[PDB]
Amino acid sequence: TQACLPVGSRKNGMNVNFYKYSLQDSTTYSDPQYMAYKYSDTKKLGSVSGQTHLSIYYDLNTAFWNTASWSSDLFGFYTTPTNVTVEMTGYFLPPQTGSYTFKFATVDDSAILSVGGSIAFECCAQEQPPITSTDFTINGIKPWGAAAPTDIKGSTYMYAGYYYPIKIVYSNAKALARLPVSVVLPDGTEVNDDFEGYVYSFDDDLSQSNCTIPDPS
Ligand SMILES: OC[C@H]1O[C@H](O[C@H]2[C@@H](O)[C@H](O)[C@@H](CO)O[C@@H]2O)[C@@H](O)[C@@H](O)[C@@H]1O
Ligand SMILES: [Ca+2]
Questions:
Q1: Rounded to whole angstroms, how far apart are CA atoms 179 and 171?
Q2: CATH fold of 1-217, please?
Q3: Which of 59, 124, 176, 208 has its CA 20 to 30 A from that of 84?
């Protein structure tokens, strides 16, 4: 897996961008091209930065489930979380060399995790429009109106001390939003929801020369 060594000032946590998703659209959220990149074909609704608590939960009254609703429940950002796509980007800093098992405990309605330079995004280009890779580490999809898969896991081998691009794209098509995010470290340590000290951001520096490490090994 391709990693990076950005030399700018490090920022804490991951950037989160918000994009429109059509209420009750039961097709788009499950299109692989949409989850990978097409979500950015609309104007960004806005963004927040510095996020370390990655897990998503929005709920509302069952009497309202066929309807849009304004709330700040997603990352403090005022939107309609009943119907929205979220892109989280940053860099993962492995404390140790080994296999890392990322997990989505379940999902509602869809989410992907991509890991690696030229997979999640290009090294030193975190803030750019999305690249087109559908080589997902995790691809979770809730069937329309039925139970979502659980313990949806994916492994990446990482070398200590390099920064690995990560991208989570998440969509809610209606009603409840759910995405519990965790990772199991090579020592068996579980990191649940709060990724402080494991995820960082760097401002784009497309001039930096030695940013990409094709083979960290
Ligand atoms: O019983 C259907 C469904 O209800 C709830 O999920 C809702 C919503 O969040 C989903 O996006 C859509 C489409 O799958 O279904 C519901 O409106 C949850 O109770 C869920 O567990 C369940 O399958
Ligand atoms: Ca939903």
A1: 10
A2: Jelly Rolls (2.60.120)
A3: 124
